[PDB]
C-alpha cells in the first residue's frame, strides 16, 4: 500500500513539486522511475535521508504514485 523504502543521508531520492503535499515530501528512486512525472517539477537530490511517501495520500498526490503502490 505505502512504500516502505528508507534511505540514508547520502542516498539520492526524488522531490516532485507537482506531486508533493509538503516540501518535505520525497519518493525513492524506484518509485519515481515506475511512476509518471513527465512535465512535472521534479528533481533528483539528497533529502537528509527519509522514508518513501509513495502510496500515502496524506503526503503525495495519487496521480504521482508508482504502478506498484497505486
Ligand atoms: Zn510528480
Ligand atoms: Zn518508494
Ligand atoms: Zn511506489
Amino acid at each position: 500500500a505505502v512504500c516502505g523504502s528508507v534511505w540514508g543521508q547520502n542516498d539520492l531520492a526524488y522531490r516532485c513539486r507537482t506531486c508533493e503535499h509538503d516540501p518535505t515530501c520525497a519518493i525513492c528512486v524506484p518509485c519515481f522511475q515506475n511512476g509518471n512525472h513527465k512535465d512535472h517539477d521534479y528533481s533528483i537530490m539528497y533529502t537528509g535521508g527519509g522514508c518513501c511517501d509513495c502510496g500515502d495520500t496524506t503526503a503525495w498526490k495519487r496521480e504521482g504514485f508508482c504502478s506498484r503502490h497505486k
Side-chain angles (χ1 to χ4, degrees), residues 7-70:
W7 64 91
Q9 45 174 174
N10 296 331
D11 285 321
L12 292 166
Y14 278 86
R15 305 286 195 191
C16 188
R17 266 81 47 161
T18 308
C19 290
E20 73 185 29
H21 282 305
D22 188 86
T24 59
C25 298
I27 65 175
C28 71
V29 164
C31 282
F32 180 94
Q33 294 174 343
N34 286 335
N36 303 314
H37 304 269
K38 305 161 149 180
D39 278 346
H40 293 198
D41 180 19
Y42 66 83
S43 303
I44 196 170
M45 69 188 307
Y46 301 101
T47 69
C51 296
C52 186
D53 291 324
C54 184
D56 182 0
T57 45
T58 84
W60 202 260
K61 285 170 213 187
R62 284 169 209 241
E63 316 77 89
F65 295 172
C66 82
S67 67
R68 305 185 56 271
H69 301 114
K70 225 150 181 283

